[PDB]
Design a protein around this ligand. Sequence first.
Ligand SMILES: CCOC(=O)c1cnc(N)nc1O
Ligand SMILES: CCOC(=O)c1cnc(N)nc1O
Ligand SMILES: CCOC(=O)c1cnc(N)nc1O
Ligand SMILES: CCOC(=O)c1cnc(N)nc1O
Ligand SMILES: CCOC(=O)c1cnc(N)nc1O
Ligand SMILES: CCOC(=O)c1cnc(N)nc1O
Ligand SMILES: CCOC(=O)c1cnc(N)nc1O
Ligand SMILES: CCOC(=O)c1cnc(N)nc1O
Lengths: 121, 121, 121, 121, 121, 121, 121, 121
Amino acid sequence: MQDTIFLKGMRFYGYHGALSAENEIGQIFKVDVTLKVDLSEAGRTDNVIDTVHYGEVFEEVKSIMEGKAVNLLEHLAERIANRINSQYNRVMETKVRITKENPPIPGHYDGVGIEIVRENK
Amino acid sequence: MQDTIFLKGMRFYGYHGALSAENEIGQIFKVDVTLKVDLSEAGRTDNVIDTVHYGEVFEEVKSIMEGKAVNLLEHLAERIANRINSQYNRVMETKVRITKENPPIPGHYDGVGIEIVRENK
Amino acid sequence: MQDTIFLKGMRFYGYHGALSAENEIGQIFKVDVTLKVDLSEAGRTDNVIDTVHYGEVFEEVKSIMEGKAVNLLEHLAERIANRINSQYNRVMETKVRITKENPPIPGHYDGVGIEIVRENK
Amino acid sequence: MQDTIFLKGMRFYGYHGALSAENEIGQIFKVDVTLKVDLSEAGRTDNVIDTVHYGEVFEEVKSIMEGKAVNLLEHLAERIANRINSQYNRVMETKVRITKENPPIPGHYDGVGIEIVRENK
Amino acid sequence: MQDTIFLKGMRFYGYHGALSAENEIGQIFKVDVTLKVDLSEAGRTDNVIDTVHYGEVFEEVKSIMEGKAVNLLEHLAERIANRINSQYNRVMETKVRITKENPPIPGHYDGVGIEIVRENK
Amino acid sequence: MQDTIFLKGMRFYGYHGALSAENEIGQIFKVDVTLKVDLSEAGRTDNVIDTVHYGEVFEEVKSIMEGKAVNLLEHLAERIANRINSQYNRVMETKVRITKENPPIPGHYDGVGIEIVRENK
Amino acid sequence: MQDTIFLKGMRFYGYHGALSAENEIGQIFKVDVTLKVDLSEAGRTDNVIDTVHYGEVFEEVKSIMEGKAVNLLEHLAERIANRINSQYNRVMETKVRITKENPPIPGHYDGVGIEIVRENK
Amino acid sequence: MQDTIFLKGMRFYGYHGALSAENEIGQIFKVDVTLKVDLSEAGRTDNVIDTVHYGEVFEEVKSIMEGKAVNLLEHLAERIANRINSQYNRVMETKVRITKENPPIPGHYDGVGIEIVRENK
Ligand SMILES: CCOC(=O)c1cnc(N)nc1O
Ligand SMILES: CCOC(=O)c1cnc(N)nc1O
Ligand SMILES: CCOC(=O)c1cnc(N)nc1O
Ligand SMILES: CCOC(=O)c1cnc(N)nc1O
Ligand SMILES: CCOC(=O)c1cnc(N)nc1O
Ligand SMILES: CCOC(=O)c1cnc(N)nc1O
Ligand SMILES: CCOC(=O)c1cnc(N)nc1O
Ligand SMILES: CCOC(=O)c1cnc(N)nc1O
């Protein structure tokens, strides 16, 4: 099964970061979410009740990104991946990629980040 | 076999959407189509009759995207995937990705959408 | 083995095309080439003689793209893939993607094209 | 395991190159690094000590890119891949892609380069 | 007075062109329209009746761009500039820029075109 | 005097619009602000007290963009221009450009909008 | 009179440059040409004979850019500006901007260059 | 006289900023420099000695951007504008634009900054 629902380039301004000054000033976090969900039924029925609504998924990402400040991007992605899977049974697997295009790193780069893939148990 | 014919960034203005106001105002839908087709013969013969003409494929996508308003992107992709496979035997598999870069979701994101992969039976 | 040498976004102005007017006016063709080549030796020795020089590969693509006008993109890719493999033994496999970002198709799209993968026998 | 930490679009100005004039004038080198690292622990603990800090990884890439001039991009990638793996046990595999968007090649292209994948033994 | 209403990056697929083959195959035309209109009243009243509605202006551009095939971009811009001014008194001046990003010119360029500025008499 | 302080590409999600459905669903509004302010003193003294702090200016734009829903972009720009000038004496003139890159207009365009220039009396 | 005909983002690979190694290896030169030409007649008549054909202008730029190697960008622009004006009476003024997005300068920048404006005497 | 020499998109990582944490972590500063310089002589002679070499100008910007940390962007631009004019007589006027695409401002914007124009006395 290779069907997916996606949310790309989601951006939030938070204060997460392993550096004290990071959490003090904050920055923009770019988030990419890809869910593994069978869309044949919804494709045939045309009923949003037979799929996973993205608007709702965006709410879950937002609430986590713009919530309490944590240290690692790994923790935010793990909280997002765990939150989506717990709420949606149709999501067989969740993949979260978070990017800090402007971290406290003296250099020239397009961005840094992490990406995790979490199956729905 | 890893050969493919593709149509990327196709854009249509339609009125599909699970919200009444969506179908009232409409928006731009971005569509990506990738077909699994062996191109050795056409590669050797140079005869467009030995491959699948994209211009025609674009017609099938257009007619569906700019046709009656449905509810889900899943339904549009399913109608496109089913329509291409029914018409072309050389297409061993069809993959449709539809993106709503500007849905009724209060946030900042590059876009949301779905992607399905349908084999040709 | 997942090492590769690549040439991306190569652009040539040619007159290939299944339409008579296409070959009359011409257009820009964008080409992407990816070769499967083991780079450990060259990585250790630092000797360009232990790898496949891209400058030369670009010559082979250019000569084919800016050569006689054929009909299908499939034929150009097949001529490129066959030409690279015949000349380089270190290339275990060749992948050619050609894009016509502006074909004779009345619509809005980022481009259309094909992609082939040819192993080196 | 599909988790990864990444550094994209890193750019350095060096004098590497198989041509004498290349090393004389120099140019910009774009580098992409992707590490295979399990992030569950760090995802649960939120402790940067349970993951691989990118800032440090960027230091290793920088020191190599802006260090002595070598001949091949293959040598730089091999030195980077070998250096990251030797220092971090949590990195199960390292992938380095280096791009010369402006080499001594008379043509129009977005760039040329190589990419290697090195497992951590 | 430096207030303006604008429509940028409007794109239409037409068959205009000084070459017979151009009008046969067609291409995409990008259009930029900038109108000189005092927006204080509308800025104070908030009444769309005190300004020039862009949706309507887009209709006038569309009808002309996707209408009969002419020869010069100069003629299309002149027809657009003359049509907007005749219909709207609040438009003190009209500026039309049309771009053919892909004309029958064997070369590499971002595009070619013209731009005219027509006062409303 | 040609000195300026600027805020470019500011984006807010609001519900302004001359159409009932517009205000119901909302959309993203892109805002560009350019202030005419002499920066010699601040350039010599290095004292943020001798210039106009952008962070504060962004607050004024935000509060207006994400405030009550009005009808015209002209009204939002007029409220922004009037609000900045009233608060800052050093701003000799304010210029506001607002863009609706995705309005209720069935077509292909990069965006539509307005731009006003208001001197500080 | 504010009418203009333009050629943007023209790119040529040449060997011009004040450094010996520059002329040895070469690089891409980006050229922007803007001509001041009254387009009312051509706008009314629709006769390409009443305007300045860009295809021809592109030929003049190309022949100069891809011709003998000079030292300064100033010399190339001066040769282009002088060549266009000498050939076309309808061009009341010529403006040439040349950019070296990748010169022999150790740093990070989008590009460097010059721009000249030459009236037609 | 409308001739100019330019340096666009220059980027440096510094620690300037009115906030203590800003100077602690640092960020990327984008700089645009435009000099008013007559290029006819250099255009005729082709002698780099008859113009202002950009490589040198880039050195002056770099040394200032990557030098001691100041508070305001206004101070950096004023130091750059004053430094260029003092060293080059042919520069009749200097214009410096500095952008902080990622300041300590909780929002979504492409960037903020200032721009000054300083004549050479
Ligand atoms: C300096 C702040 O660093 C981080 O937040 C961080 C570093 N490395 C990794 N892997 N994750 C992080 O969140
Ligand atoms: C509010 C409209 O929503 C949709 O159209 C929609 C939502 N979720 C999914 N998965 N598909 C849709 O088409
Ligand atoms: C109208 C010209 O069409 C083509 O050249 C063409 C169409 N389809 C495919 N698959 N390849 C082509 O080259
Ligand atoms: C002319 C310089 O060429 C190179 O540096 C080079 C060429 N080919 C490959 N595969 N690697 C290189 O580094
Ligand atoms: C070959 C087609 O050319 C044109 O259409 C054309 C050329 N030059 C100018 N100035 N305008 C045109 O429309
Ligand atoms: C359909 C909504 O239209 C508008 O909001 C609108 C139209 N025209 C102008 N000039 N301004 C607007 O805000
Ligand atoms: C090192 C090569 O430099 C140049 O070619 C050059 C430098 N400065 C100016 N103003 N023009 C040039 O062409
Ligand atoms: C919070 C840091 O702010 C600044 O550095 C700053 C603010 N406003 C202006 N006009 N210039 C600055 O440098």
